[PDB]
C-alpha cells in the first residue's frame, strides 16, 4: 500500500473529563497520542489540528434547537434548563460537563476535515479517533454520544464519492449512523455488534433498510466473547462480498475499543491482533479510508490498540516494547504493547454464524 497517512490531533482533547465514575474519558486519546509519538511514527504521518466545527455545520444533520441548547447549557445554568434536558436526553446517561461544546466542536471539526482531506486527495488515509460518536441521532444524546460527526464525514465524502461504505465493529450497533442512512442507497452501514439484551438492542439481522436503503444495511448479531479466530472468520467473507458487489468509492470504518478483551463494558474476547486483522483486511482493498475511534473504556488497552493500528496503516509493525511514554504506569506489569484475551468460553456456535452468512449473502445477491 504505502499510503500517505494524514493525522489529526488537538492538544485540548485530554482536558475535558466526564463525570467521576463515568466510563467515557477522552484522556485515552491523549495517551494513545503519546504512544504514537514516542514510537517515532510522527515522521510517517501528516499531523494536523483541525478547526472546530460551527453551529451551521452541526445543523446539517442535527437540529437548530438541539445545537442551540448544546451551545448554552452549562453545569452552572442547568437548573433552569429542564425541558431540553429531558427532551434531548442530556441528563445522566449523557451528562453535561464543563467543555462539552468544545469537545463536540473539536470532534466534529476533526472528522469533517478528515472527510475534506480525503475528498481533495491530500491523503488516502485520514485518522480521527476523537470522533466516532455513533449513537446520537440528530436530536438526542445517546450512549455517551452527543454529536454524530460520522454522518458529517459521510456527507462530505458523498460530496465527492458516488458510494460510501460504513463499517461498524463496535460491540455496540451503529444505531445513529444506520438510522441516518436507512433510506438512502448511497451508504451501506455494516455493524458488527453484540445482539441480545444489550444497550443498543437494535441491529437485528432483518434490518436490511427501508425505502431506497432496502438491502443497503448489514447487521451482524453476535453472541458473547467472540475471539480473533472467529471474528476474522465472520468478518472477512462479508467484507469481500460487499466490496465485490456494492463496490463503494469511499469507505468509513469505526474502530471502537469496546470489543477488546476485558473491556470495562465490553464482553468480547478479541485480542490485539484479532482487532488489527479487520484493519489489515480493510486496508487490503486500496480505497481511501477515514479511521475513527468509537467504544472502549479501558484506556490502557485502547491506547495500545490505537497505536498498533496507526502503526499498521503505515505498513509497519511497531515494537512490542514500550518507548517509555509519559503515562508508563498505565500499561500493566510487563509494559508491553498487546491485549491479552481471557479464558472465557466463546458461545458463538458455527451453525448460527453459518445461518448468518447465508442470510446476509442471500440479501446481498441483489446489490450488483
Amino acid at each position: 500500500d504505502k499510503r500517505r497517512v494524514a493525522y489529526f490531533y488537538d492538544a485540548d482533547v485530554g482536558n475535558y473529563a466526564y463525570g467521576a465514575g463515568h466510563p467515557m474519558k477522552p484522556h485515552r486519546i491523549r495517551m494513545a497520542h503519546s504512544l504514537i509519538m514516542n514510537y517515532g511514527l510522527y515522521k510517517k504521518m501528516e499531523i494536523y489540528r483541525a478547526k472546530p466545527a460551527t453551529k451551521q455545520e452541526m445543523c446539517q444533520f442535527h437540529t437548530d434547537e438541539y445545537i442551540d441548547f448544546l451551545s448554552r447549557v452549562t453545569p452552572d445554568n442547568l437548573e433552569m434548563f429542564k425541558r431540553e434536558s429531558v427532551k434531548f436526553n442530556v441528563g445522566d446517561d449523557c451528562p453535561v460537563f464543563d467543555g462539552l461544546y468544545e469537545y463536540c466542536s473539536i470532534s466534529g471539526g476533526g472528522s469533517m476535515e478528515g472527510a475534506a482531506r480525503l475528498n481533495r486527495g491530500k491523503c488516502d488515509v485520514a485518522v480521527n479517533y476523537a470522533g466516532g460518536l455513533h449513537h446520537a441521532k440528530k436530536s438526542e444524546a445517546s450512549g455517551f454520544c452527543y454529536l454524530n460527526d460520522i454522518v458529517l464525514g459521510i456527507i462530505e465524502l458523498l460530496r465527492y464519492h458516488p458510494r460510501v461504505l460504513y463499517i461498524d465493529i463496535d460491540v455496540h450497533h451503529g444505531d445513529g449512523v444506520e438510522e441516518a442512512f436507512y433510506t438512502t442507497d448511497r451508504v451501506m452501514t455494516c455493524s458488527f455488534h453484540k445482539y441480545g439484551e444489550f444497550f443498543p438492542g437494535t441491529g437485528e439481522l432483518r434490518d436490511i433498510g427501508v425505502g431506497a436503503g432496502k438491502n443497503y444495511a448489514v447487521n451482524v448479531p453476535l453472541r458473547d466473547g467472540i475471539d480473533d479466530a472467529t471474528y476474522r472468520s465472520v468478518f472477512e467473507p462479508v467484507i469481500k462480498k460487499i466490496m465485490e458487489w456494492y463496490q463503494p468509492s469511499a469507505v468509513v470504518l469505526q474502530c471502537g475499543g469496546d470489543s477488546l478483551s476485558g473491556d470495562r463494558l465490553g464482553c468480547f474476547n478479541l485480542s490485539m491482533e484479532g482487532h488489527a486483522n479487520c484493519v489489515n483486511y480493510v486496508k487490503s482493498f486500496g480505497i481511501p479510508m477515514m479511521v475513527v475511534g468509537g467504544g472502549g473504556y479501558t484506556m490502557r488497552n485502547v491506547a495500545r490498540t490505537w497505536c498498533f493500528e496507526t502503526g499498521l496503516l503505515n505498513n509497519v509493525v511497531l515494537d512490542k516494547d514500550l518507548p517509555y511514554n509519559e503515562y508508563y504506569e498505565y500499561y500493566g506489569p510487563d509494559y508491553k504493547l498487546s491485549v491479552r484475551p481471557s479464558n472465557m468460553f466463546n458461545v458463538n456456535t458455527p451453525e448460527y454464524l453459518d445461518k448468518v452468512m447465508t442470510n446476509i449473502f442471500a440479501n446481498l445477491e441483489n446489490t450488483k
Binding site: 490531533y9 497520542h33 448460527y352
Partner: protein, 318 residues
C-alpha cells in the same frame, strides 16, 4: 486574601488528593523517537473543508411522580401536563395556585347557598338541554384526572391486566449448564423439534452443547442454532415458537385480526351445518352475538383445504 485555606477537600482516592499513601491502603495494597514535546510544531491547522465558509409524591391526575405543581389551600400534587389547562412550566404562574375543588370550595361553597347556585344553573338550562345541566354544572367542581377504563370493560376480557402506573399488560408480558437440557420432572432430555436432539456435549468438552429456550407457550424445546437466535428471551415478552397461529394477517392492503378472549359466560359457541363450505373467520374451535367461535369439525378443515387448492389450480389451469 492570602490563600484558599479550604484547598484540599476530597478526591476519588477518598483522600483530599494532597495526602498520599493513606497508610491503611499501603498495608492493604502492597506486598510487605523523541518525547511528545515536538507535536507543537508538526501540527498544521487544516481548515480545507467544503463548508468552512459558513406535598404528594404523585400527580393528583396521573398518580405518578415527576414535576409537581403542588397547592397550599389543598395539599394536592399535580403534574404540569396533568392539569386543565396544561400549563407551561417555563412561564410559571408565580402565585397562589389552588385546585379546581379548592376554587369551588372558596368562591362558591357557602354551606347553604350552593343550592342557590346549582338551582340557578339548572334554571338557566332547564329550558335548554337540561339532562346534561346537572353534569355540566358539577364537572366545574372537579380536578382534572387521567382517563381510565371503567373497571368493567377490562373485566369483559379475562386476558388483560393493568400495569404498575396503569399501563396495558397481556398474556405475552413475561458457565457450563447441562442441567438446562433436563426436564427435571421426568428425567428426560430436551429433544428440539428442529434438530431432534438435545446436543448436551460434555463437561469435558463444553464446546459441543447447544442452547435451548423451550418456547414459553407450548414448552417446545428449540436450539438457538436450529432457529437463528443470538440470546435468550429474559427481560422482554414471552418467547413463542413458530408453531403458533399468526393471529394477525396483512394481505394485499387488508388487515385481519383474531378476536380477543372473553369470559365464557358471554362466549356464544356455534356450530354450522353445511360442514363443507362455510365462510368463517379465524375464530374456530377444532373438535353481542358477534364473537361466535365456530366449532370447525376438523375433517371440514381438510375438505376446505382440498377444494381450495383445487380452485388455486383451476384459476391458472383453464
Amino acid at each position: 486574601p492570602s490563600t484558599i485555606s479550604e484547598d484540599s477537600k476530597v478526591s476519588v482516592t477518598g483522600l483530599p488528593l494532597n495526602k498520599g499513601p493513606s497508610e491503611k491502603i499501603k498495608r492493604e495494597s502492597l506486598w510487605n523517537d523523541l518525547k511528545t514535546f515536538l507535536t507543537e510544531n508538526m501540527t498544521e491547522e487544516s481548515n480545507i473543508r467544503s463548508t468552512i465558509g459558513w406535598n404528594e409524591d404523585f400527580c393528583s391526575a396521573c398518580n405518578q411522580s415527576g414535576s409537581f405543581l403542588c397547592c397550599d389551600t389543598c395539599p394536592k400534587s399535580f403534574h404540569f401536563l396533568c392539569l386543565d389547562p396544561p400549563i407551561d412550566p417555563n412561564n410559571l404562574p408565580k402565585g397562589d395556585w389552588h385546585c379546581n375543588e379548592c376554587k369551588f370550595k372558596i368562591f362558591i361553597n357557602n354551606s347553604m347557598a350552593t343550592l342557590k347556585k346549582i338551582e340557578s344553573n339548572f334554571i338557566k338550562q332547564n329550558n335548554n338541554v337540561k339532562i346534561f345541566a346537572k353534569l355540566l354544572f358539577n364537572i366545574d367542581s372537579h380536578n382534572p384526572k387521567q382517563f381510565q377504563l371503567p373497571n368493567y370493560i377490562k373485566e369483559t376480557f379475562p386476558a388483560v391486566k393493568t400495569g404498575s402506573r396503569g399501563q396495558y399488560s397481556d398474556e405475552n408480558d413475561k458457565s457450563y449448564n447441562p442441567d438446562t437440557h433436563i426436564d427435571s420432572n421426568s428425567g428426560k432430555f430436551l429433544i428440539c423439534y428442529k434438530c431432534n436432539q438435545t446436543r448436551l456435549g460434555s463437561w469435558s468438552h463444553p464446546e459441543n452443547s447447544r442452547l435451548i429456550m423451550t418456547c414459553d407457550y407450548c414448552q417446545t424445546p428449540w436450539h438457538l442454532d436450529c432457529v437463528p437466535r443470538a440470546s435468550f428471551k429474559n427481560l422482554g415478552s414471552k418467547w413463542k415458537c413458530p408453531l403458533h397461529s399468526p393471529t394477525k394477517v396483512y394481505k394485499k392492503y387488508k388487515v385481519w385480526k383474531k378476536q380477543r378472549l372473553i369470559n365464557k359466560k358471554n362466549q356464544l359457541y356455534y356450530e354450522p351445518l353445511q360442514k363443507i363450505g362455510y365462510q368463517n373467520n379465524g375464530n374456530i374451535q377444532i373438535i353481542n352475538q358477534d364473537f361466535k367461535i365456530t366449532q370447525i369439525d376438523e375433517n371440514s378443515i381438510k375438505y376446505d383445504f382440498f377444494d381450495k387448492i383445487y380452485k388455486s389450480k383451476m384459476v391458472q389451469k383453464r
